[PDB]
Design a protein around this ligand. Structure first.
Ligand SMILES: COc1ccc(-c2cc(N)nc(N)n2)cc1
Length: 340
């Protein structure tokens, strides 16, 4: 494979210490994915640490990373401070038959941050900082010129700028697309997958807002809100919390009958284990009246019952079954949860 530079996964065989075009010193492998690999590297010329995404030597992944480059460069054009919520692509190059995207060095992802809490979660105040940033990021992506659906929002794709501050950025637009297809694809990571995508329905930018609602509850509680072992398990766990989706959704939904039954009266219920629909209140998951998740926030700053009530309101508005009425980023940012 490739004058010996590639393994049988078409990945570049990374050597710690290697120097590239007399410029970059590869320090280590920090990241792996379907796309290929990510390495930490020192740019001798600019005197800075960088993350290089090394794409696989296969034409599908090369073509997809070309779409990623296009989108990142489109975003970088914009003369707004909102584009600083998206990881900066400095430049790209072909090297030993691999496309390489050079990024700014960021820090840990939000999954690492949860592992650092031993999966008991971060304060409501830190959740709020992350939420403001993520809603701004989504307000940016929903700019008409852009209309980018990220399509894979989850803790693992949201990184800290540095381990000392609360600043974050979204990475990995490899699964992204611009709005103007309205077709079904098996997309989003299962825990963060919108009901429209579960139901085989066409999707728009609202799916990133679904994923964000799920992420913010998990940041605070320490655990995924909806941890499905499969699509049926996933929908069933959503229905435990949010109850039966509206009939006007299910009537139009190609995969409605994978999870639901239409009854003779034209109402729907779960098909043929689980708590009855809507019995797992977000009110209780958040511990609104009981000192927050598992009572662990009992008498703490900015953990009042009213604070939890505003958070709950915002989350339930992000977890709307109906993509038409699901809160849009502008309005999310005007929510009283952010009046601190
Ligand atoms: C810590 O620095 C990093 C680590 C990873 C990335 C990154 C960017 C990107 N577009 N796609 C993926 N998969 N990863 C950027 C900076």
């Amino acid at each position: 494979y490739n004058d010996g530079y590639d393994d049988d996964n078409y990945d570049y065989i990374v050597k710690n210490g290697e120097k590239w075009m007399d410029r970059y010193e590869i320090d280590s492998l920090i990241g792996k994915g379907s796309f290929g690999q990510v390495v930490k590297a020192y740019d001798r010329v600019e005197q800075e640490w960088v993350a290089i995404k090394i794409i696989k030597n296969k034409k599908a992944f090369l073509n997809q990373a070309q779409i990623e480059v296009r989108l990142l460069e489109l975003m970088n054009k914009h003369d707004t401070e909102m584009k600083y919520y998206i990881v900066h692509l400095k430049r790209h190059f072909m090297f030993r038959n691999h496309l390489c995207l050079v990024f700014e060095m960021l820090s840990y992802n939000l999954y690492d941050l949860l592992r650092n809490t031993n999966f008991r979660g971060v304060s409501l105040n830190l959740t709020r900082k992350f939420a403001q940033q993520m809603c701004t990021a989504l307000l940016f992506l929903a700019t008409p010129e852009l209309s980018i659906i990220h399509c894979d929002l989850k803790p693992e794709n949201i990184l800290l700028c540095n381990p000392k501050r609360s600043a974050i950025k979204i990475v990995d637009f490899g699964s992204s697309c611009q709005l103007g297809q309205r077709i079904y694809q098996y997309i989003q990571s299962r825990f963060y997958r919108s009901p429209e995508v579960l139901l085989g329905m066409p999707y728009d930018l609202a799916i990133d807002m679904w994923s964000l609602g799920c992420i913010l509850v998990e940041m605070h509680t320490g655990e995924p809100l909806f941890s499905g072992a499969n699509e049926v398990d996933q929908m069933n766990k959503i229905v435990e919390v949010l109850g039966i989706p509206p009939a006007h959704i299910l009537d139009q939904a190609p995969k409605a009958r994978k999870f639901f039954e239409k009854l003779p009266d034209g109402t729907w219920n779960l098909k043929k284990e689980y708590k009855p629909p809507g019995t797992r209140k977000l009110h209780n998951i958040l511990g609104v009246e009981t000192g927050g998740p598992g009572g662990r926030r009992a008498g703490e700053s900015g953990h009042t019952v009213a604070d939890y009530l505003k958070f709950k309101d915002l989350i339930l508005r992000m977890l709307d079954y109906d993509p038409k009425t699901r809160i849009q980023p502008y309005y999310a940012l005007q929510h009283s949860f952010f009046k601190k």
